[PDB]
């Protein structure tokens, strides 16, 4: 019997993504090697029909999304394809072509769902992971593309009424957008656009008074700090900043993380002039 | 008497940068307004002769740097000019032109200085701040420029034998270079480049076990963590990671900073395969 090397085996699975009779198992095997194979993304991108096969997997479940009928097995399979897209989103050789093909858009219907069943939560979290890995690269062109889409209202809806984990990733995505100069100007260009962000941030602080989440509070504070770099937003935050960020509500929680304290201390200092 | 509005006052000082008789005082007044006037950078950049006058201030002290004869008065004046260049380096309207003019290169003679006197430390720290603000914008064009210069050995020198605060900012600059995909591959494509970085980082851990610095340890671990994303570096760090990063040497101080613990623990897990 022949014992293929590992590179040959990966290419075999990639080739097996073309045909529907072998695709589900190939998706499973490749998704497991996502961490072990550093060049997996260009291997996927430059393979004929492969990216098209993965997008077909995504779109195949669109009819199960609205009305919500998605099964655990359908979510399982499509999230394997999504894990391969996250690999392509985060690799320097494929990231830019990934954006040029507008691939993140195919995940947005998944971000609109509100069903709390495990198949939908698993799909939503996996989709947020693709977008989160995309903005973590700190590339200006990522933010430019996202600003042409509805990503900000999508994140805000999840920040307000998602699971704590979904909220943390949605806030991180908003945080990366705000950290970009164009993104900060975008959100602050209209007082109504800014007001929507601030209202939703303010309500998250009220929840954080009841559910002390260190990871969520860190990114909420960071979004407030970056907003304080815009003069129009900085004047409004002097009045609409929740009182829980001024007293000692999160004092005992923040004593464990000095990085967030300095941010909150630099935030209140930027609101005094 | 006429009460001149603030925008015209700022422009008066900007115009006074063009004459030697008034430049010093204008430098002082403008540097004090750096954080109050959000559009100071394009005002400086689009004013005739202003940038050329700031570069003349910098270049005017090149003969005082080697041999070291820089006075406190000279250092104070040029650091006011550097403070204005720092806000040009970080503004979205001017940063690209700042890079295309290759302005950061004018600061590198100051990073070669080794005098531990107050005029030289103040100049070195201020210069590091300009570069730190420039890389903090998380953009690829910044890192591309820096890689055509000798910024990396300059940072490594400072990380090895600079003051505690100088080490922190130089490590942060190296951190931002490592976080860029091109920067990581640049430092890791040659084993000589990687080992030089690893040797410097290894030595800083030893000093941190003697003189603890929470902020400096944070950025050292981040550099180790980002290096682990490169295969050739991960397998090498499996053997050359300092023992103080594997036991409870820093666990006493890390209990006050949860962010750094999540980084260090994530790093060793990648080294355990």
């Amino acid at each position: 019997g022949p014992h293929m090397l590992e590179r040959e085996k990966i290419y075999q699975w990639i080739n097996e993504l073309s045909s529907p009779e072998t695709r589900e198992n190939a998706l499973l095997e490749l998704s497991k090697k996502r961490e072990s194979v550093p060049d997996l993304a260009p291997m996927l991108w430059h393979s004929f029909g492969t990216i098209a096969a993965l997008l077909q997997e995504i779109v195949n479940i669109y009819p199960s999304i609205n009305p919500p009928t998605l099964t655990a097995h359908q979510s399982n399979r499509v999230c394997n394809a999504l894990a391969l897209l996250q690999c392509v989103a985060s690799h320097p050789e494929t990231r830019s072509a990934f954006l040029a093909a507008h691939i993140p858009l195919f995940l947005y219907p998944f971000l609109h769902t509100v069903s709390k069943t495990r198949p939908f939560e698993y799909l939503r979290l996996t989709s947020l992971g693709v977008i989160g890995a995309l903005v973590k690269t700190d590339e200006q062109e990522v933010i430019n593309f996202l600003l042409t889409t509805e990503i900000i209202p999508l994140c805000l809806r999840i920040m307000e009424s998602g699971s704590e984990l979904s909220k943390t990733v949605a806030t991180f995505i908003l945080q990366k957008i705000l950290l970009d100069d164009t993104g900060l100007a975008y959100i602050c260009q209209t007082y109504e656009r800014f007001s929507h962000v601030a209202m939703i941030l303010g309500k998250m602080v009220l929840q954080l008074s009841k559910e002390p989440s260190a990871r969520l509070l860190k990114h909420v504070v960071r979004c407030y700090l970056r907003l304080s770099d815009n003069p129009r937003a900085r004047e409004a935050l002097r009045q609409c900043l929740p009182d829980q960020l001024k007293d000692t509500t999160f004092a005992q929680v923040l004593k464990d993380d000095t990085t967030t304290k300095r941010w909150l201390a630099q935030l209140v200092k930027n609101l005094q002039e | 008497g006429p009460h001149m509005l603030e925008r015209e006052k700022i422009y008066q000082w900007i115009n006074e940068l063009s004459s030697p008789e008034t430049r010093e005082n204008a430098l002082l007044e403008l540097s004090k307004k750096r954080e109050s006037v959000p559009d100071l950078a394009p005002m400086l950049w689009h004013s005739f002769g202003t940038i050329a006058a700031l570069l003349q201030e910098i270049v005017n002290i090149y003969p005082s740097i080697n041999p070291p004869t820089l006075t406190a008065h000279q250092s104070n004046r040029v650091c006011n000019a550097l403070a204005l260049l720092q806000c040009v380096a970080s503004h979205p309207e001017t940063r690209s032109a700042f890079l295309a003019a290759h302005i950061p290169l004018f600061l590198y003679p100051f990073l070669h200085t080794v005098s531990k006197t107050r005029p030289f430390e103040y100049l070195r720290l201020t210069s590091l701040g300009v570069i730190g603000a420039l890389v903090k914008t998380d953009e690829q064009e910044v890192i591309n420029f820096l890689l055509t210069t000798e910024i990396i050995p300059l940072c490594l020198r400072i990380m090895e034998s600079g003051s505690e605060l100088s080490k922190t900012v130089a490590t942060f600059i190296l951190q931002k270079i490592l976080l860029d995909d091109t920067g990581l591959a640049y430092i890791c494509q040659t084993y000589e480049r990687f080992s030089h970085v690893a040797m410097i980082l290894g030595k800083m851990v030893l000093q941190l076990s003697k003189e603890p610095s929470a902020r400096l340890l944070k950025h050292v671990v981040r550099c180790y963590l980002r290096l682990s994303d490169n295969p050739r570096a991960r397998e090498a760090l499996r053997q050359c990671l300092p023992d103080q990063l594997k036991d409870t040497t820093f666990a006493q101080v890390l209990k006050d900073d949860t962010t750094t613990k999540r980084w260090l623990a994530q790093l060793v897990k990648n080294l355990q395969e």
Binding site: R118, Y122, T168 | Q266
Partner: peptide
């Protein structure tokens, strides 16, 4: 099974935590 088990759910959580932190 081919469904969603605790291992898959926990591995996703660790993936997301490493992305945002």
């Amino acid at each position: 099974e081919g469904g969603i088990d605790s291992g898959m759910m926990l591995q996703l959580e660790k993936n997301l935590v490493d992305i945002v932190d």
